[PDB]
Ligand binder design. Structure first.
Ligand SMILES: NC(=O)c1ccc[n+]([C@@H]2O[C@H](COP(=O)([O-])OP(=O)(O)OC[C@H]3O[C@@H](n4cnc5c(N)ncnc54)[C@H](OP(=O)(O)O)[C@@H]3O)[C@@H](O)[C@H]2O)c1
Ligand SMILES: NC(=O)c1ccc[n+]([C@@H]2O[C@H](COP(=O)([O-])OP(=O)(O)OC[C@H]3O[C@@H](n4cnc5c(N)ncnc54)[C@H](OP(=O)(O)O)[C@@H]3O)[C@@H](O)[C@H]2O)c1
Ligand SMILES: NC(=O)c1ccc[n+]([C@@H]2O[C@H](COP(=O)([O-])OP(=O)(O)OC[C@H]3O[C@@H](n4cnc5c(N)ncnc54)[C@H](OP(=O)(O)O)[C@@H]3O)[C@@H](O)[C@H]2O)c1
Ligand SMILES: NC(=O)c1ccc[n+]([C@@H]2O[C@H](COP(=O)([O-])OP(=O)(O)OC[C@H]3O[C@@H](n4cnc5c(N)ncnc54)[C@H](OP(=O)(O)O)[C@@H]3O)[C@@H](O)[C@H]2O)c1
Ligand SMILES: Oc1cc(Cl)ccc1Oc1ccc(Cl)cc1Cl
Ligand SMILES: Oc1cc(Cl)ccc1Oc1ccc(Cl)cc1Cl
Ligand SMILES: Oc1cc(Cl)ccc1Oc1ccc(Cl)cc1Cl
Ligand SMILES: Oc1cc(Cl)ccc1Oc1ccc(Cl)cc1Cl
Ligand SMILES: N[C@@H](CCC(=O)O)C(=O)O
Ligand SMILES: N[C@@H](CCC(=O)O)C(=O)O
Ligand SMILES: N[C@@H](CCC(=O)O)C(=O)O
Lengths: 254, 254, 255, 255
């Protein structure tokens, strides 16, 4: 039960976003939620999607995590509007398709660095600013993919960005542990989202999970959301620096 | 919320057992619980301990996991007394004391095979017998230790038994996944228990966590029990073949 | 790499396809003196034939069934008397019963699970304890494992749990014996057609998966395992212990 | 091994304590022709002097700042015209600001994080791309990493995240270049006293902890890394790619 808790959820674009799965679970459990977005179009979808939740009010903030000033001023404004928070769900990544759909060895410098910036460094800075609203401690979750742990076909520059993200969770866990702030990752199996359309071969990845993964089915956004609830709540006290695979067991087989 | 769930908890020795932590938590959450014990000092005991739970009956079964008959007939009888169950917590391990200190290279064949038998194979047979009481699926959790993933001083033969136990979980996840049975582990940090006494140099292990783990503190039986409630329930539906460290982040640092 | 004036015990040659025969060819070619141990007289007869291919001036052949403490103990002690001190051991030994290597893992019998642990894991422990007696200036023990020890692979079943156990055994041995200057390491070999692979269900589809999906897009062979064994058993790998090197065309690194 | 008529590019020698210099000595002793790349004009001066300890009859020194594509592109092209085709590249390059290193990880600057990614991880990718043009029959590329890429190590901070990225870069390149018969691997070296180690807070307690706790109970040295490099760069390691070999006295394997 999450009444009297407040979570910031970053990275909803539409109803298929993984962070909307998180939102529904946390809302169902009585949490107060605050949302962040980059594009106008995403604020618009948030304004619509809120009509399905129980949030008595829209708490929406534009934060493009490429900008320090936006991350810093964003969280400062959230603190002024709703007070201290209990956690952050981070559901944000980006890379160019021009890099993704080429050979990994042909990745450009600007594109490799773009992916690191949005997909990994953004957690470091978000945690830094979020820490200020968690003086009694709290919980931070980021979303990763098994391509951070192994070389998967076509995932390419994003796989290197996710490896970087998973180490970021571990170094943040260590840094922020004494402040009673836990930092963890969920490694989600493939789910049809707007961003999935950038991963070449995506339907093939879905089919391989059904045919090979222990549970012989794909996961969805609500399943990622239920494990987020566990990680953002006191149910997972003691658990930090961990990568929980919500992927029908695919990580465990070869 | 676990009202109308039933869980078999194996491995309570006394008020300090990790499995009793698990029991208080599932009991608080409204589960019907069933308990197995090895021998008749644990029983007398057990009976007294359960006045602290809201269990309105005492369902207790002797099962020494070294005997097929006892496991086969114990789950059979459980099945007859309470019907289908929703999951199994396995909290059971053993090795000879001489082996948990001094030199791993001097371990006896008998001592090595005894630790494998009780600490690893017992999950395979308990799984096979429990599956019979879970026609619509369910959840199996075992308790391991970092010494199954890394060589740790003194833990010696039990570390090889936990390596084996951790694979056991993965192979059972693969096998039982189509039957909708999830199989996972919780890698607990060190906890002062009756069995901890037999681990060479336990007190130093304890202190190392406080000094070096991200949370700078040790965990307890109830923090294990909370992650057990997660893994035993539908919050973790997308999760199988997994090992969750409830160890203050220790597993993530070096 | 030159291994003249080194001496290596190789355990688990059955025939010309054995992984340990790849190791033997490579070590022998590098000038090492080799001692071979076998379980069945048929393997000894095979060893006698296979030696005529190697440069070894003599046959050092010992029957050691690793289920027997006395055979391991008396075998290594006899080896010490015939050749003196050794430089390392290549361990290439596993077993489980047929029925535990296809279909369903949850149905594994206690007897079959413990058999597999006994031969495929505990053997390395007692071998190392006895071999250590012949390595007073230090040396190098290598065991052979498979990717099924790290992940659940279809059909591998009880052997996978045996390999997990082997891989932790290597780590505990490494820690225990490091101060004696004995390194202990594993080679995680890719799938290779051998007599014992006839026991793994779906083995042909395993090979074919490697060709299609592994970074090098081809299978490995026994000599490539023997080349990494030469590195591990020699002074090139000083510093390296508790380590599991995958000779498998990259397959462990991909999903 | 046996590396005559092989040619390797070694990137990242600054002085006699550099890890890459340990690679150079081992490879040079094994008969390789070596080509050296540097950033600072002062590192070139050290090379010219370190080269008298070596059997290289010719000094092949090239300035390449891996921050600049132009420099990596023109550098390898020039190498190709001066020495023809090469057999492999040893990459020993990393960098991050002190000011980011010696602050709390959570206080890392965006610009210092991207700097460490750019020099210590991206550089392998572009190096691999340009070096492929000089390896039409295949070859081997080895990068240097540290345990702090796999676990959160006190003080290593932004470099830990750059090494994690570098270890993944290795696996993705292994996959991409495998069909070209180019293997790409990492060595995970234990702590070694070098100029760059001065940047790591608590470096001397890291050394002491290896001596007290690692299976071998001693630290490793640059030559030990060089010897595993010789294996990885040569045909002994055929079949090995996407791999991370810990040259660290076993420390990776214990907790
Ligand atoms: N779908 C899957 O199979 C899968 C599997 C595993 C992991 N993941 C991870 O899950 C996370 C969420 O992605 P998703 O699949 O749910 O796709 P999604 O719905 O497309 O969400 C991606 C989100 O990232 C945000 N974003 C990108 N760049 C940003 C920036 N500079 N500043 C702020 N926000 C930015 C986008 O916001 P705007 O649209 O406003 O630009 C969008 O809300 C990602 O980290 C992804 O890598 C996805
Ligand atoms: N405490 C820790 O720091 C630690 C850390 C990580 C993991 N673990 C794991 O947690 C689990 C529980 O241990 P614990 O620390 O809670 O110790 P514990 O209270 O002493 O529990 C051990 C239990 O195992 C039971 N058992 C032993 N052999 C058995 C057999 N042959 N058949 C049936 N039951 C048998 C014992 O029963 P009897 O008393 O009747 O003999 C006892 O109830 C173990 O698997 C252990 O390795 C412990
Ligand atoms: N082939 C592969 O794809 C592959 C892949 C990865 C790992 N491996 C591993 O490589 C190792 C060698 O197997 P292989 O494929 O080369 O098969 P192999 O030629 O059939 O060799 C197996 C050896 O194990 C010996 N053995 C079995 N039980 C023994 C016992 N109790 N005492 C002494 N020796 C015993 C056999 O000797 P006898 O015939 O005399 O009984 C035989 O020489 C094993 O650990 C295997 O698991 C194989
Ligand atoms: N020392 C250890 O304990 C340890 C342990 C594990 C891994 N490693 C790794 O080993 C590698 C070598 O470091 P080291 O310890 O040998 O220290 P080092 O002697 O200080 O070598 C570092 C080299 O990096 C080069 N470099 C930095 N930025 C560069 C750039 N932009 N372009 C081209 N070259 C650049 C330096 O060149 P200039 O001097 O010309 O600037 C220097 O030659 C690094 O990847 C390091 O992370 C070191
Ligand atoms: O990480 C992902 C993994 C998968 Cl299988 C599918 C979608 C993913 O998400 C992304 C993939 C590429 C880009 Cl450019 C951005 C995002 Cl959010
Ligand atoms: O696994 C354990 C790990 C730790 Cl740190 C402490 C206690 C543990 O539990 C055991 C240890 C030894 C034996 Cl013989 C039996 C059990 Cl239950
Ligand atoms: O470990 C192995 C892995 C593979 Cl892919 C192929 C063969 C293997 O070797 C064995 C397999 C089963 C048994 Cl009963 C004995 C051995 Cl020696
Ligand atoms: O990676 C390393 C690890 C260790 Cl233990 C010691 C030195 C290392 O090398 C570096 C450390 C910091 C910077 Cl700024 C640059 C380099 Cl080359
Ligand atoms: N059809 C795209 C794949 C993208 C997807 O399936 O989302 C390709 O393979 O080029
Ligand atoms: N054809 C049988 C034999 C096994 C094998 O070829 O290894 C199977 O695949 O089950
Ligand atoms: N003097 C540094 C240590 C630097 C080093 O040990 O290289 C400190 O702040 O600990």
């Amino acid at each position: 039960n999450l009444e009297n808790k407040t979570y910031v959820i970053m990275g909803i674009a539409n109803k298929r976003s993984i962070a909307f799965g998180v939102a529904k679970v946390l809302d169902q459990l009585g949490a107060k939620l605050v949302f962040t977005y980059r594009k106008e179009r995403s604020r618009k979808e948030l304004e619509k999607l809120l009509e399905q939740l129980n949030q008595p009010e829209a708490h929406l903030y534009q934060i493009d995590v490429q900008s320090d000033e936006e991350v810093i001023n964003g969280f400062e404004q959230i603190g002024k509007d709703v007070g201290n928070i209990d956690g952050v769900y981070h559901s944000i990544a980006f890379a160019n398709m021009e890099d993704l759909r080429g050979r990994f060895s042909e990745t450009s410098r600007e594109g490799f660095l773009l992916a690191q910036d949005i997909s990994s460094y953004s957690l470091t800075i978000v945690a830094h600013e979020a820490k200020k609203l968690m003086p009694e401690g709290g919980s931070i979750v980021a979303t990763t993919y098994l391509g951070g742990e192994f070389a998967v076909q076509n995932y390419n520059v994003m796989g290197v960005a996710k490896a970087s993200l998973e180490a970021n969770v571990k170094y943040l866990a260590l840094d922020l542990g004494p402040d009673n702030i836990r930092v963890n990752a969920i490694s989600a199996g493939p789910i049809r989202t707007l961003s999935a359309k950038g991963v070449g071969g995506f339907n093939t990845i879905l089919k391989e999970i059904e045919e090979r993964a222990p549970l012989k089915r794909n996961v969805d956004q609500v399943e990622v959301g239920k494990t987020a609830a566990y990680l953002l709540s006191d149910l997972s006290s003691g658990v930090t620096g961990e990568n929980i695979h919500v992927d029908s067991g695919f990580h465990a087989i070869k």
